[PDB]
């Protein structure tokens, strides 16, 4: 079984930071050397697992997400980072591992008249929990006056938009971030990856490993039959 990554990575319009998409896929081949052609980048910061080793390691669940930010806060999406752009918008867990990719996106994420489809939050009550998304649009109380009106003095709109123009230089140039998050755990026991092995031999004295037990001997065909639920075979004194 197989999953495509090219359609997962890219979207027609990348969502804003305050509301990001996230896709969870499993039970497919963990081939990661194909994404070099469907996405332009320069870094490919895969901190935990080497890119050439990903073809054999087994992963239970993975997360894929993407979002657009400004170029001044490219490195702010990292564990142990603080700031207004990270604590109230999107912050990584302190034990994060995976592959974070950032690209300078000016040809596809900028307009001469000013692209205004990108949104973030700047005022909020307190720091938010890791991997939590807030989409509420309520006026922040930043003054002694009660913020019961729609807008006014000491009542600031939290959702702030980016102003992007190709005439700008670097730093304020928009960037696109694609994050592939990995985790390693147990219990489903069916989302295991590349554990496949091959080349049975017969009528020779060899070593064998069958789903957990090892042994040494010769293997032959017998005129037995098992019930469809039975797996092992045993006799007197607990011998396979």
């Amino acid at each position: 079984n197989l999953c495509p990554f090219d359609e997962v990575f890219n979207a027609t319009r990348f969502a804003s930071v305050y509301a990001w998409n996230r896709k969870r896929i499993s039970n497919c081949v963990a081939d990661y050397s194909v994404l070099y052609n469907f996405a332009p980048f320069f870094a490919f910061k895969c901190y935990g697992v080497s890119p050439t080793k990903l073809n054999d390691l087994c992963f239970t669940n993975v997360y894929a997400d993407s979002f657009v930010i400004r170029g001044n806060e490219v490195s702010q999406i990292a564990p142990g980072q603080t700031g207004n752009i990270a604590d109230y918008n999107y912050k990584l867990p302190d034990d994060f591992t995976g592959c974070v990719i950032a690209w300078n996106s000016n040809k596809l994420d900028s307009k001469v008249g000013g692209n205004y489809n990108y949104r973030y939050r700047l005022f909020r009550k307190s720091n938010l929990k890791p991997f939590e998304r807030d989409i509420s649009t309520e006026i922040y109380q930043a003054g002694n006056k009660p913020c019961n009106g729609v807008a006014g003095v000491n009542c600031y709109f939290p959702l702030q938009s980016y102003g992007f123009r190709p005439t700008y230089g670097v730093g304020h140039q928009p960037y696109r971030v694609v994050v592939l998050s990995f985790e390693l755990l147990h219990a489903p026991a069916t989302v295991c990856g590349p554990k496949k092995s091959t080349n049975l031999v017969k009528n020779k004295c060899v070593n064998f490993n069958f789903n957990g037990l090892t042994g040494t001997g010769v293997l032959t065909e017998s005129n037995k039959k098992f019930l469809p639920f039975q797996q092992f075979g045993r006799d007197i004194a607990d011998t396979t």
Epitope: F157, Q160, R165
Partner: nanobody
């Protein structure tokens, strides 16, 4: 539905002083960049001054250097444009405008190109004898 309110202006003698004030209702300051643009009858609109988003780098035009000052306070959420030593050619209507981010002089861009998202009604400043 964010409005920008302007106060000041009027009949001022040449050599006098004034202080225009622009207050944001919906948005807050020290997150956007607020500039001033003046327009004369029979002419096209030209910028005056700006303050960037963080801390604030003050930029001034060629004809307004050394005389006009800009300041911003977040306690009253107001930008202040101080007129000193007005000459006779400064009879114009003034508008305050705001754009998100550090719009004023980022990269090869400069705030002469009037593409600010928020605008205002504007106030008239007239010098005469």
């Amino acid at each position: 539905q964010v409005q920008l309110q302007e106060s000041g202006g009027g009949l001022v003698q040449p050599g006098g002083s004034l202080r225009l004030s622009c207050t944001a209702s919906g948005i807050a300051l020290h997150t956007h960049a607020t500039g001033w643009f003046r327009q004369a009858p029979g002419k096209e609109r030209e910028g005056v001054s700006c303050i960037s988003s963080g801390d604030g780098t003050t930029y001034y035009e060629d004809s307004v250097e050394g005389r006009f000052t800009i300041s911003r306070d977040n306690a009253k959420n107001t930008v202040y444009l101080q007129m000193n030593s007005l000459k006779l050619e400064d009879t114009a209507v003034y508008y305050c405008a705001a754009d998100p981010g550090a719009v004023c002089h980022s990269g090869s861009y400069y705030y002469t190109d009037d593409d600010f998202y928020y605008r205002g009604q504007g106030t008239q400043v007239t010098v005469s004898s």
